[PDB]
């Protein structure tokens, strides 16, 4: 029984709505500061769900520090060039499995 579970907490960026091959998603970026050396990582967060994405796109604002709770996926993709095979690292979020939560104070 495979188990793919991620958790995140950090700064949000470039928030925008659209579709993933005709799927109502609200993709954005979460930046965990995985630390003299301060190493950063900018994760993509694709929140699927016709309603869920809308839900998220409204309460979630840029700058917000939120938690992410979903699967670690990676779309293959075959760009115009070249033979080099590269995968697309994002984070599929979608209830009841996925989960988003903004932090205040």
């Amino acid at each position, epitope marked *: 029984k495979s188990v793919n579970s991620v958790t995140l907490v950090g700064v949000v960026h470039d928030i925008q709505s659209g*579709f993933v091959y005709e799927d109502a998603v609200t993709q954005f970026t979460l930046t965990t500061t995985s630390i003299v050396v301060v190493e950063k990582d900018h994760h993509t967060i694709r929140c699927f769900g016709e309603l869920f994405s809308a839900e998220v796109k409204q309460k979630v604002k840029e700058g917000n520090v939120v938690c992410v709770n979903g699967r670690l996926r990676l779309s293959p993709q075959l760009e115009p060039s070249c033979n080099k095979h590269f995968y697309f690292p*994002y984070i599929q979020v979608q209830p009841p499995h996925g989960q988003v939560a903004v932090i205040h104070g």
Partner: nanobody
Amino acid sequence: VQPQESGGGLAQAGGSLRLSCVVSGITFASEAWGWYRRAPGKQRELIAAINNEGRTNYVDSVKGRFTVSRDNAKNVMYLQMNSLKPEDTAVYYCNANLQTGTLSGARLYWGQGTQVTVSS
């Protein structure tokens, strides 16, 4: 940007079939498309993908084996399929590859797909 595919059902081992992916109406040549496939059990898997002109990149599999095209004339994608292995059984779809995957859409829509079968 409306899927309208055709061609495919069943052929002897190592055949040669063509595909007609017609974009219903609104501009097509503007984007960069490609074909997918749905194995009887496996999920959605992108295979062929022609550039916007355009030099094409194929999967290790269909590399040299198949070659997809793109004609702005009639707005149709043709997948030159040759030596059709029995392991090439699936429902094939024509659609536009992202940009180059990390990009978000704006509308889009799925098709109905054509069933294809191959058995030695």
